[PDB]
Amino acid sequence: KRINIRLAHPMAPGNNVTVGYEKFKELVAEKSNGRVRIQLFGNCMLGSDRVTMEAAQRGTLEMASSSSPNMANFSKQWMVFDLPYITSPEHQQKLYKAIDDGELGKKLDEIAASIGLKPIMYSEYGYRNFVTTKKPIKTADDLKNLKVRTTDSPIEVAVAAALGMAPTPISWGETYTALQQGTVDGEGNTFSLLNDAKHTEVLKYAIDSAHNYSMHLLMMNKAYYDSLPANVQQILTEAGREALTYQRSITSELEKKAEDAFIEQGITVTRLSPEERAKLVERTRPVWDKFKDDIPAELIKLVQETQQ
């Protein structure tokens, strides 16, 4: 008989994370010949990121996807991935290998288990970049005294302050108005979300700072997973792994298209010099020692090992 598995997530139609979960649904159906069906509830149809991951943890929902910074609200260990410049785009393929098949992946499995969850896909969300409405930013010093919108992430706030910026936490929904009306000067996010949300209408400058990395973590209730037949577990695990291959590639392509939409809209996108990138790394590194006591050294080391 048919197994119906509900999957909740916060992302909008056509979004890189959404299309990965569509691939997941398609592969689960193919592999199970229709016996297992993923029912998608995107765009917060079942709740916010937090509401749906609590339901998955508790066992009233089978699967949910949460951003890595939002997972820090269930377990602080996930904060390792938010540290400034802990990873960079140049080493992304080795990061994926470590998560997919390596000791990093296994430790993350254990951490999820301790809060009632089984990881199924580590969806790529991307690297955040600083953008501004009116003030040109081409250098590290250009960032000093910028009023910048932040999320509620303590690491995001610390990074802004380390760079001499003035951080203001503002909900996503209030951020367009804050930029338009001038209560902040800028923000930091992926080019794809900024363009998709039409913030580009009010922006004029961007730098490829890549000062924050994140993922969207698709989790299954672990007790539920452990209740399934071996062959169904295998279907889910394999569909996840294969959908992720596609999702990581689609993310790259959508980010290129987002960056082109920026240029088309007259936004000046500065490619930081090695000298200027180095200053952002150096200025932000004290943030790691500030949060040292809250993130396990072993986990920092496993992530750094992917970068060299």
Residue numbers in the entry: 29 to 336
Paper text:
Of these three datasets, only the 1.48 Å dataset was truly ligand-free, whereas the other two datasets had sulfonate-containing buffering compounds [4-(2-hydroxyethyl)-1-piperazineethanesulfonic acid (HEPES) and 2-(N-morpholino)ethanesulfonic acid (MES)] in the substrate-binding site arising from the crystallisation condition (see crystallisation and structure determination methods). We had suspected OaIseP had tightly bound a non-cognate ligand present during expression in E. coli, a phenomenon that is not uncommon for TRAP substrate-binding proteins as documented by Vetting et al.. Upon further refinement, we were able to confidently model HEPES and MES buffer constituents from the crystallisation conditions into the densities (difference maps shown in Supplementary Figure S5) and refined the structures to an Rfree of 0.229 (1.89 Å resolution) and 0.241 (1.65 Å resolution) respectively. In both HEPES- and MES-bound structures, the sulfonate groups form a salt bridge to Arg177 and hydrogen bonding the side chain nitrogen of Asn217. In the HEPES-bound structure, Arg156 is tilted slightly further from the sulfonate group, only granting a single nitrogen atom of the guanidyl group to form hydrogen bonds with the HEPES sulfonate, whereas Arg156 is turned slightly closer to the MES sulfonate allowing the respective salt bridge to form. The smaller MES utilises a bridging water molecule hydrogen bond Ala40 to the morpholine ring oxygen. In contrast, it is interesting that the slightly smaller MES does not induce partial closure, considering the water molecule bridging the hydrogen bond with Ala40 could be removed and a direct hydrogen bond could be formed instead. The melting temperature of OaIseP (TmD) in the presence of MES (5 mM, 58.5 ± 0.3°C) and HEPES (5 mM, 57.0 ± 0.6°C) is not significantly different to that of ligand-free OaIseP (ΔTmD of 0.6°C and −0.9°C, respectively). This suggests that these molecules bind weakly, or that it is the full closure of the protein around the ligand that induces thermal stability.
